[PDB]
Symmetry: D3
Subunit: 163 residues, 6 copies
């Protein structure tokens, strides 16, 4: 079965809470990364319609500092698939509420996997229908490959560290 990339899209608009602020009253990278895993998993659920799990998150670069005045929106769709794997694109936009002026804060490639009876299950492939969607699709296979290599470099480090 097949599924449009818009059929698994999830948005989360929210205020910045002051507990989640730091030494200079800026949002902790961690809370951003927490919001990205949660919105990203919803997309992954909508698309595969089965119980998923976070396997990897690609590198994330924090472009701009977020404040107590700012709002923060997390847009998330599925833009690639293997058999059980989903690559979810997530864009993080920070709107200053009073000033009104938006700015891009982080973008993230994050990788969800469907699981059934403890074993990974099949997921429908996603098909793009937008310039941005198309470019993501085209470029996606390259990343999925750079990731298989990355996964092995992580597993090696788990074993070196052991001994």
């Amino acid at each position: 079965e097949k599924k449009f990339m818009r059929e698994s899209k999830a948005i989360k608009t929210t205020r910045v809470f002051p507990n989640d602020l730091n030494n200079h009253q800026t949002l902790f990278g961690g809370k951003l990364l927490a919001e990205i895993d949660s919105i990203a998993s919803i997309a992954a659920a909508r698309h595969s319609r089965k119980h998923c799990v976070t396997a990897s998150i690609d590198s994330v670069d924090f472009l701009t500092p977020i404040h107590q005045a700012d709002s923060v929106c997390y847009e998330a769709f599925v833009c690639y698939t293997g058999k059980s794997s989903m690559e979810v694109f997530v864009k993080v936009i920070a709107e200053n509420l009073l000033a009104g002026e938006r700015r891009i804060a982080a973008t993230c490639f994050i990788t969800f996997v469907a699981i059934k009876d403890g074993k990974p299950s099949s997921v429908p492939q996603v098909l793009p229908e937008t310039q941005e969607e198309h470019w993501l699709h085209k470029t996606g296979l390259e990343r999925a490959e750079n990731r298989k290599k990355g996964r092995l470099k992580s597993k090696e480090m788990a074993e070196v560290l052991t001994l």
Copy 2:
């Protein structure tokens, strides 16, 4: 002019039902959140200044953590620039009933000291032990490797901000 031990930080914790998902397994988000949290302490101890998370290298979720396990986060500064700091964070899981332990993940995560408004000078780290040396070899390599990631991520910002047609 400072040692990696001088910024070491350990947080050992319990897993809380609210961070379990539908399969009763810890969320990735919870883990990334604590990797940022401890890392931020490490970078603080070291720099002796207030820092901010510049970037977090990719992280691979090697194992599922359960309700009956405990998670240990170990982290220290292992590389330095002039305001930057490569923090290395190691995530050990351990069944509390059984003695079985496993590495759940590793993460390089980059903090930037800020004195007033903009980045400030942060001391250079000298490895002491064997494993502290082995993590200094790749320091210069990943630093560049990342320097290329930021610009890529910064260009994609502009494609979305300025609306540049995708191929640039």
Copy 3:
């Protein structure tokens, strides 16, 4: 000095957390009511681009029990505007992450007030564009009026209660 309703839309898609669950493993009304106030204030900030404050919430009727299996999406726009008030229409949909059977769990009128230098500050008027949006505006004044009445029944009660 004017603004379309859609300029104040704000959505929050989220999962149900087991701590916000009760003895039947059902979502508490309060987490729903808390979420509604949260999403609605962003809507109220986007619109007035000023510091708003929650003055009242109309009755909510909880139509359907939300489960650990479901997501809950919260849509929120300003439908009516006073001198410094603003009615925010808030729709609460709840779909089963797997099955995919969507349903509306609650709907809520909720009244925010712009505030500056500690005293109520002016807001734009708001203009509908859709069938549903037009019915909101049109029926809006009837509601604004019942609130000026209910607020007196409320103030009077506080006074009796001191006794």
Copy 4:
């Protein structure tokens, strides 16, 4: 058997926590409504034993602002009873801890339904004792009708959005 209203009374007094303050440093409405559902559910629980569910909540008017320097008290008890329904009354007092000046911040009627086997269940009737327990028990049956009419619009609006039934 029928209970006597003060057999299901519940008080929660509490601090105000910086995370639940506004842009203005005043308490959010949502926190208050969440606390009101919380206490009410205990009252509703004590009265009828069993296990209840929030059917609906009458409008709430936020009479006062609440500040980081204050304390808030939630007092709640069943006042009306239908067959399975329970009307909980909730009084919300704010107090400056350093002043000792107390105000009413809000009141709320909030209906609760007992559920024994995934379907509704037989709640005991509530007898009032004091004058206050008289003064708001009498107008009980009035505001219970209003809510049959409130539910109708809401249930009606559901189908308009669900079934897309054209507005009117």
Copy 5:
């Protein structure tokens, strides 16, 4: 500059939340302690009308396990003073909402110190009214004495541990 105990009484009834449950589906001891501190902190404020801090907690003995379906009532009041210190009694009662049968889960003497402008500040004296209130007042002096001592052992242990 004298106040009755009822003028500091504070009550907190809560349900037991699944986060704060341990692996045996029973409440964490540290949740019970966190709550005991927060309710005792209100009482000390109610009574001092000044901003207070926690100086000590006496030993607490957890007499009953608290399960998922129980309520928990915290009842705190000031029960003995000195110059800048206030000593709050906290009785914690756990009620099974279905069975309706209560039990005492713990009681706690917790000490707060009123503090104005970086240094401890003056506090009203307390006046008992009931038998219970009178009982806890007379016995205050003796409790105050042991605190003064254990404090020394605690500051001793802090010098020697480093």
Copy 6:
């Protein structure tokens, strides 16, 4: 069978979050007690290899205020035992991140009890290895005895109350 103390060692270093502060920008005592219970519950499990429950906490003397700038290290390990019970020692040390001027904020003896199928359950013996470890181990007996008294005092106060 029996384990060394360092086989139950648990460490928790942590930020001081602004929600856990009071009006004076200082850490709530009850948060410290919450953190202390949680890190000691790991030490207990690590050593017991069974489901543990807090049975009591000794008095705790808060020697230092902890400001929002500070970090908090909690260090727990088991240091006396009986049949099903385990007494855990916890030292709390407060470091000013931007000056690193460490001080001990508190120290705590907290007693946990291993539990198997409703009832208390067998737990290994603890072996000291250092001065401190040897130190706390010898004094363990006296402390176990004084605890035994209070529990009766604590049960006494529970019968006598409502």
